[PDB]
């Protein structure tokens, strides 16, 4: 129910495949606290945090879903934590794949109907619709996404 345990739980199925070595989750947490990215969507969704580690072997996105908001650390320097229903985590190796994936994510998050569906839809369906969006773009080739990386979170 906190961002530290959610990040560890979320990273676990991705570390299991060797996508990233050296545990990674502790670095993801330290990275998010030192410099948050923009979080509040025009609607009810929340933007995807990223780590840009240098021990990442390939690119991948973990998604999952929360039932209750966990008041994930805010971004704008104001006393405004941003309630998050869906916590995401992406991996990357260099600046260029982070910029490309974040721009794609930007395009995905402004689709409000998709995010509400993410809030109520099943896990097989979450996998299917995000996979479809990743493979639709001419960009994002090579980013790994599989059913094992989408799980319910506490």
């Amino acid at each position, epitope marked *: 129910v906190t961002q530290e345990d959610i990040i560890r739980a979320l990273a676990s*199925p991705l570390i299991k495949d060797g996508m990233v070595d050296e545990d990674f989750a502790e670095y993801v947490i330290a990275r998010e606290n030192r410099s948050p990215t923009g979080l509040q969507a025009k609607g009810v969704g929340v933007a995807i945090p990223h780590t840009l580690g240098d021990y990442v072997r390939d690119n991948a996105i973990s998604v999952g879903i929360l039932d209750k908001p966990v008041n994930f650390s805010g971004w704008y320097q104001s006393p405004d934590p941003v309630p998050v229903r869906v916590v995401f985590m992406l991996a990357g190796r260099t600046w260029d794949d982070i910029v490309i994936v974040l721009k794609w994510i930007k395009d995905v998050i402004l689709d409000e109907e998709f995010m509400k569906r993410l809030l109520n839809m*099943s*896990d*097989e369906e979450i*996998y*299917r*619709q995000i*996979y*479809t969006r990743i*493979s639709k773009a001419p960009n994002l080739s090579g980013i790994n996404f*599989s*059913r*094992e990386y989408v*799980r*319910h979170l506490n």
Partner: antibody
Amino acid sequence: DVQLQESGPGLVKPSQSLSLTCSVTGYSITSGYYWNWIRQFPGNKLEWMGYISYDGSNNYNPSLKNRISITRDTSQNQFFLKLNSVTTEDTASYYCAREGPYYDFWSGYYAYYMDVWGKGTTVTV
Amino acid sequence: DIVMSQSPSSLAVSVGEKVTMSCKSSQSLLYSSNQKNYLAWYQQKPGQSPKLLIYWASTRKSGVPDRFTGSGSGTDFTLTISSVKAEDLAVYYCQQYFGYPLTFGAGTKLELK
């Protein structure tokens, strides 16, 4: 219970696109479940051609992203598969299938089972 | 893509009550949220479209004596034809539902003169 039927100008020249239409019965396209194509070659080789979702999503599995295009007509209860610049490697029989989650001891095991299928063929050239 | 294969390519015998079909996968195909490996055999008669008999022992509508035995990535996923099936000329396919793309392995059993 439910049967599908392939129809269309299977004898298609490489200068034009393949156009194959599948009529389906027993249900409404927009309520649920997914429709897809299974392509079968002269041997035991089968290929997955992707999905057309009840919600309109089109997931083009093949790497030939600008070759395959799938559309829908919900008033005719039909799906339309097109392949641009069809070549000799695409001569195969073609089956439409309707599949999605079916009840198991769990409310959603998403075990498609190929419960619903069609039957038909096309020839290139 | 996840590659599926029929290790013996079947055709083990023309006649034999206790012989099996055997699939292997390059991936574990196991969902940790369910502890179930999603795969199917799709038995097909010549000249007909394929139909599924066994999905991890599920949907056995046209049930006959049979089995589903494997669990891992490669391992040995099998079905047992049993003494009589009344579908003795058939082709079987190897299928998985873990990654997005699907491919099929295959092999047959045929008694022809």
